[PDB]
Amino acid sequence: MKTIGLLGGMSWESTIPYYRLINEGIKQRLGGLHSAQVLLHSVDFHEIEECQRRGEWDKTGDILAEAALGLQRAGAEGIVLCTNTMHKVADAIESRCTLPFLHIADATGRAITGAGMTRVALLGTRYTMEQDFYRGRLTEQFSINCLIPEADERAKINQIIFEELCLGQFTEASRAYYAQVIARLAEQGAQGVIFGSTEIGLLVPEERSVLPVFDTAAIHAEDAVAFMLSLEHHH
Amino acid sequence: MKTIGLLGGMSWESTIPYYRLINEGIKQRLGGLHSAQVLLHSVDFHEIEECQRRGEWDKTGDILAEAALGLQRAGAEGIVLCTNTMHKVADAIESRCTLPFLHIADATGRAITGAGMTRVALLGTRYTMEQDFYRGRLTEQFSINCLIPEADERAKINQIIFEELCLGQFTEASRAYYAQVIARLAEQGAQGVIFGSTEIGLLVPEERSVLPVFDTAAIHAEDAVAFMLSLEHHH
Numbered sequence: 001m002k003t004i005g006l007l008g009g010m011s012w013e014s015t016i017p018y019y020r021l022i023n024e025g026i027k028q029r030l031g032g033l034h035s036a037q038v039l040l041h042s043v044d045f046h047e048i049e050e051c052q053r054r055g056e057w058d059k060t061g062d063i064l065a066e067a068a069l070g071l072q073r074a075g076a077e078g079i080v081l082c083t084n085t086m087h088k089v090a091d092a093i094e095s096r097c098t099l100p101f102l103h104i105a106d107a108t109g110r111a112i113t114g115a116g117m118t119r120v121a122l123l124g125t126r127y128t129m130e131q132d133f134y135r136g137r138l139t140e141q142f143s144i145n146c147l148i149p150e151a152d153e154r155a156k157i158n159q160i161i162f163e164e165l166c167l168g169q170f171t172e173a174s175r176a177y178y179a180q181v182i183a184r185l186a187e188q189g190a191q192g193v194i195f196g197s198t199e200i201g202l203l204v205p206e207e208r209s210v211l212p213v214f215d216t217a218a219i220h221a222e223d224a225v226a227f228m229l230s231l232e233h234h235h
Numbered sequence: 236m237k238t239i240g241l242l243g244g245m246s247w248e249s250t251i252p253y254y255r256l257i258n259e260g261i262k263q264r265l266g267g268l269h270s271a272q273v274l275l276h277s278v279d280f281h282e283i284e285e286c287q288r289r290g291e292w293d294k295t296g297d298i299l300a301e302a303a304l305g306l307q308r309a310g311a312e313g314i315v316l317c318t319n320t321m322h323k324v325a326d327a328i329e330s331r332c333t334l335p336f337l338h339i340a341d342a343t344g345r346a347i348t349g350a351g352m353t354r355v356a357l358l359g360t361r362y363t364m365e366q367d368f369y370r371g372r373l374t375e376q377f378s379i380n381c382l383i384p385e386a387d388e389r390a391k392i393n394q395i396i397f398e399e400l401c402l403g404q405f406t407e408a409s410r411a412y413y414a415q416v417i418a419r420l421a422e423q424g425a426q427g428v429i430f431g432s433t434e435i436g437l438l439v440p441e442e443r444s445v446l447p448v449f450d451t452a453a454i455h456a457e458d459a460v461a462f463m464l465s466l467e468h469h470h
């Protein structure tokens with residue numbers, strides 16, 4: 001198998017599910033005591049957030065690209081960035097490090113098009129919803145049309161993420177509000193819904209979404225595994 | 236803070252607690268949004284465990300020293316090996332990678348002499364319990380001697396580590412068993428018990444012990460945080 005390089009610590013808690021799912025996918029596919037060949041670089045998030053909060057995305061891309069190049073030196077053969085929001089600087093990493101870059105939106109695009117769909121909705125942070133980096137990569141690589149909530153809903157959905165889901169509160173009222181938004185977007189033509197982080201999936205089980213759900217982080221880990229074994233899109 | 240290099244995947248289930256506790260310890264000490272600078276090399280355990288089986292210890296030493304050098308090339312400033320057993324080849328790693336090597340025994344041995352004890356019980360793989368690499372280290376460096384369970388219990392203890400804990404079966408049958416073995420060794424004058432496999436902390440809650448507990452994963456991760464911040468023994 002190929003060795004995967006992980007760019008993580010943003011946050012460390014959200015890195016653990018990449019490591020878990022990658023190892024489980026390898027152990028499922030290879031059998032027995034097989035585990036994943038993984039190189040991980042975990043940042044001090046403090047230093048990233050200081051750049052992000054001042055909008056110094058060039059500094060963040062310089063830090064993350066230097067981290068990728070270190071993994072490549074240690075023998076990684078592909079790069080996974082274990083955060084949606086930091087794909088703001090994916091172009092910095094992809095253009096500077098010659099290793100295949102497995103963009104989070106590309107993994108999801110492959111899943112969306114493998115479900116026969118052209119038109120989806122995206123729920124996440126307001127930043128992730130409103131910036132070009134996620135939805136734009138989907139169109140550029142796939143022609144996938146990506147619907148977002150209106151401005152008032154974006155603000156409510158975000159507030160729910162940072163005031164509740166982030167602090168462990170998965171409440172029915174928030175659950176129902178998301179399912180209502182998903183439903184509105186379904187009636188506008190959305191054929192599936194991308195949940196931009198693990199926690200939205202924690203709040204909204206697929207039973208409660210009227211649309212097929214694409215959990216972008218779990219999908220990302222599963223695509224890493226396909227890459228390491230050279231399967232499907234990576235054969 | 237100094238970047239710690241972790242050598243893990245032995246098993247990957249036991250690498251996760253290292254990653255969690257190191258981040259947790261760094262955030263406790265630095266506060267705010269601070270997380271750990273960690274480089275991790277996670278191996279395919281199938282290769283390592285095959286070598287152990289075959290008695291090809293020099294080969295595992297080769298594998299692990301090269302992983303360490305690869306972490307050093309990516310920026311690691313200290314080496315932590317997330318496995319007691321593989322400390323049998325710590326000398327090939329410590330000699331070919333000249334980063335500070337935080338030997339798992341040393342931190343435990345510091346903690347044992349620290350409580351004013353000298354003779355303890357040792358639970359671990361059969362290698363870790365039966366052989367000299369580990370207990371010879373505690374003797375050499377601290378004059379500490381260990382009592383180990385009888386030959387039948389050692390076989391059962393080991394079968395539990397490799398068939399259960401490394402594949403993620405944690406059960407009260409196993410746990411309870413480890414509990415009873417402790418009782419016996421206390422009765423034999425053991426002043427404390429070292430959980431000398433990094434996944435006996437993933438099975439037994441500390442408070443079933445009739446002897447004081449020295450958990451090597453926990454102590455090792457604490458020693459990593461102290462080295463990273465140059466605290467306590469690290470100056």
Ligand SMILES: N[C@@H](CCC(=O)O)C(=O)O
Pocket residue numbers: 245246249284287317318319320321360363396431432433434
């Ligand atoms: N958890 C065991 C791993 C044994 C092995 O690597 O075979 C230990 O710390 O030794």
